[PDB]
Symmetry: C5
Subunit: 307 residues, 5 copies
């Protein structure tokens, strides 16, 4: 079994797609192993670049294919090189930009946290072993973080493991285990932007909707609610169109639904106070009571939301 | 007739396009057959990867081209390999990402269910038979389902068949039947998100629209109706822009049309009650009757919608 | 002149682009001609697939290039094969997906009808003739039609013709006529969806806008119009954003403009009735007259729209 | 200096990108020059197509690369051919689809006019001269123009010139002038659609906004303005989202700004008339005066806009 | 160490992507060095174009690969050429369009300024030195600037430097320093468009919101605020949808949030003035005081924003 040492340099993780749970990773991949020694020009290591690489493979050079397991579509490989050492060492180095898949739960949207993973595995060989994996995710940790959209927490975690494929041929007596390198980078979303421009105004609207009870007439109370109703519909549209697209109910989507309910409940109470008492009494002890209670009931339900 | 065994590993089915009735399928395809025995290095099976494969084809190796019948544009094939066995067996294995087509009826949008199908067929040979198809759609069934957008019902069903092409040449006396593998995966859309964030507020708005009859004056009743009218127009826009795009009337689209009608009918009744009675009587037995009847008429019509 | 028989199988016509007047066509293309006889393996027809085809062309095999005249960008060709017959026949078969152009007038948008055309022509040869064209547009005609977006009317029409290119070289004495195959498929748009979810609510709003005349006060009449004004602005936005994009005025766009005018004319009449009569008379014989007349004037102008 | 005669057939100019000032050009390019005579099959001109062309170049055939100077990314070339004449003539013909750049001023958006240009230049040779350029922009001039989005004014203008590159090597004593072909096609946008569906309603809204002065009460006058304000905000959104995107203020954008100002100026006058006169007088000679003057002040300022 | 002279011609910098902090660069790259002398046809420098270049590399020609460090995906290279001089000089020249990455802070959006940078580095050699970098950013400086979206300030800055890579192999005793060319072009965004069509109406709306205090009744004051509330929600949507997309709070977003706060504070003051005084007094000295003070308080807070 050939010992393969890999190194993955991650330049940038960007372009997260919430609809398809994917993310882009730009960087380099280096893999080193030792083969039979070789006569090189003079005796310095020989450099073979791009189109010249397949010329060496056609003459018999063994270059194993390593596949990104969780990639989404063939990645864009930039420059690639082979470094052929006279003592037998071989170093493959290539620039790449690829889109990778991982299970991503966005339910607690503004305050959610995700981990971006890479999964590397040889495409055809089980008799060849990944010896050690070093990733160099040397993007900043203390340069721009409050300004940046995602907060990387710690240095990336690595784990070389062995994957057992059962459904295989019938001629392999026991060779159905492959070496898989797994890189993981944990990150937390910076909610600053979504707090100020989305959650804050949504609170301001939800709060100010309760000021309908400070209207004197019943006609004033009920008719204004329909203008508040339209405002929440507008704000829900503004929220869903500008924020990333999701077929899942987010924290903000609960806040939106809560606002929807708060207005509908107000309409019920406003009509209730009118027609609850005999002979047209307006239950003024209700309008004034919920004038402060209605704000409190929402805050109590919000805490049980975090139950 | 050559016996070819295929195996299709489905990693992920995603990216449904409602406008073009397409869907993306990432996974692997394996095909195995037995040919004339062959001298391999030593005597272990030889592995030929990617660019090296066409070198073997130029020297005479027979590798049939299998076409995805229902594919939408040439798919993106990642790494590919040939496993050449000394006794004659040949195993082709390739990673692919492709877009596939099938008839998809989205009319009952939030609660609809679809089946994703693959159709495999040799491109040039009828004297070569697909012997058995095993698909490994080992995506979860009981890990994430309530969180996931689609619910896979069962393991994929397959069907190898023979397709008769009539319009052909004139030199084939009887050989116009091709082996077609057909894989089918049934799935049900998870309506959780669309119920809470779309159907529920639409109900709350439609319901609260009936509270126009609880206004005392006629001027209050008619003018408020026009503000409710704007809200339904606003909500239909929010609905059509955020939800997947469709040139077909969906369940939600019927609910939207229903809200449109409920408001217009209210305006008729509101105006009717004013000018229906002689000498300016306001038919107060109507406003109060439909105050509860108008909500009920909508519920009765909704049940005949499910007829 | 070489006799070339073509056959075009049309799997699917989809993805009409109203902004660029284009549409996608998936299917196969077959071309057959007879050349000098040939020694084949044994004596069965030889099959040459994909990358192996250019190998035969480099050894001298004459394979003419057929260009889609009205294609938009080089089309995506899937699998391709050559079938070489010993008696001299040669059959080229290839799967393709391409985007094609044709003049498409969408002015009567919901009820418009278009025809999708293909135009085939050899790229370099005029001394080579397309002998007969058979298209197999065996998409359904009586399976799904009311559910489908477009209605195909009849079997596709074909026409081989001769195109005269004048601006050419100076060395051709008379050879400037090329063989062109022209396929035409006529189709009518299914207006069901646009009627119910777009045309119907637009009528309901336009109609209900006239109910402003049933308000008793003049202040009620004028102020309500401005809320109705906003509703038409809102509905025009919803219409233009969801419906296909066009730099041309459609039937719906005329209906929208009509709604704009109906409201502006209402504001004129409402203000006119106030200040038309001496000493502050409110011309109540106008408000009630146009209470019914204003709806009729719209219907009369709508019929002259179809003039 | 080799004499190269080019001819550019322009099939369609479409896909104007206002954000990036680009446009797509589909058509053919032909280039002819005379070289050393050649032994051809028999003695008829030889046709070399697509993949076969580079075979002749590897054997020594001189085929110069002509670059589209103003192209945006490598263009999509369809079929290409070489016609090798026995007397030495060589004719290169190729189908192409490319995106081209030019400075485009969209400030007078609905009524603007642009010119689409192509710039052709050899990539490596200054000792080779473009002898004459004939373009065949035989798209219609009198077939569909009122229906079409753009109006082509005349046949395209050509200009072969010499471009002086100063910053070059140090070994060229005087050879730093290159032959550049420049094609120009002038076009005027058909404003019919934008007039009816955008400019017309914006006028109606701006006009109808002035009808606020016909309200009797002061409370009626001020409150309605905010509904008209919302209408202009709504209409500004509808305008910017559907119309092509631009980081420049257009004619329509000025009309929008004008509507914003008309309403804001109205609010000032409405509040001014209330509190301008001593003892609470409502300056009724103002409300009625600007009832007609405010429309005129807008019309007077609009004519100074065309100053 | 080989001396390599590069020259970078920048035709156009366009397509800034605010979400991914990228920008497109179209232009040419020229690189010159001197090698062992060479026998050329006759003795003039030989020109080798495109596909013919790799033929010389297969025969042994050394052409080093230079990589754009900050590129986002492999760039699109148009025509490329080699100029082989008899005395040993070699000139590589290629057209390219590429997407490049750099840290871009858009927080002060309308008035922000950015710098577009390129970073060039050899892919495999440290024993080869970039001798001098000359960029020709000969885009206009005094032709169109007020009309153009970006303002280039000065001639582009260059800096050849040495980058120390630590994490490397174990066989290099001291050779881990690479030559990096860094080009920088400073640019300031032209805020003209965003001022007139976005900042100005936002001011007009924010200002006119203060006119709620000039209403006489309390019911008029509170109900109108909710219509003003909806207008800001609409305008926030229009702002975020049309302006470039950003997960960061911009100057406009602060102006938007300020408008949100201004209205909510008014609702508090409007309700405060009602219920602050004993026995139902309406604190008319507040409504009139903040009638002018509320405008001033916003202006006072706005200057401390620029603190």
């Amino acid at each position: 079994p050939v010992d393969v040492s890999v190194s993955i340099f991650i330049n940038k993780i960007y372009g997260v797609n919430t609809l398809e749970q994917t993310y882009k990773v730009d960087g380099y991949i280096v893999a080193q192993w030792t083969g039979k020694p070789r006569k090189t020009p003079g005796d310095k290591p020989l450099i073979v670049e791009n189109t010249q690489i397949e010329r060496w493979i056609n003459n018999g050079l063994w270059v194993p294919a390593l596949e990104f397991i969780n990639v989404v579509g063939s990645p864009d490989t930039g420059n690639k090189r082979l470094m052929l050492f006279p003592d037998g060492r071989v170093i493959y180095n290539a620039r790449f930009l690829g889109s990778f898949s991982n299970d991503m739960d966005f339910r607690l949207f503004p305050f959610d946290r995700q981990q971006f993973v890479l999964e590397l595995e040889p495409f055809s060989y089980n008799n060849q072993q990944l010896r050690f994996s070093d990733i160099q995710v040397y993007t900043e940790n203390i340069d721009n973080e409050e300004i940046d959209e995602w907060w990387i927490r710690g240095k990336a975690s690595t784990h070389i493991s062995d994957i057992r494929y059962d459904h295989l041929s019938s001629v392999q007596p026991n060779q159905n285990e492959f070496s898989r390198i797994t890189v993981r980078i944990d990150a937390v979303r910076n909610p600053s932007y979504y707090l100020w421009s989305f959650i804050l105004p949504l609170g301001l609207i939800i709060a100010a909707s309760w000021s309908v009870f400070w209207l004197e007439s019943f006609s004033e109370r009920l008719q204004t609610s329909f203008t508040l109703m339209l405002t929440v519909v507008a704000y829900a549209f503004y929220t869903s169109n500008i924020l990333p697209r999701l077929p899942a109910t987010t924290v903000i989507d609960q806040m939106i639904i809560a606002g929807y309910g708060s207005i509908f409940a107000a309409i019920l109470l406003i009509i209730f106070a009118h027609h609850r008492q005999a002979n047209g009494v307006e239950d003024d002890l209700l309008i004034q009571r919920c004038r402060l209670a209605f704000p409190l009931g929402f805050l109590a339900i919000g805490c049980v939301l975090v139950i």
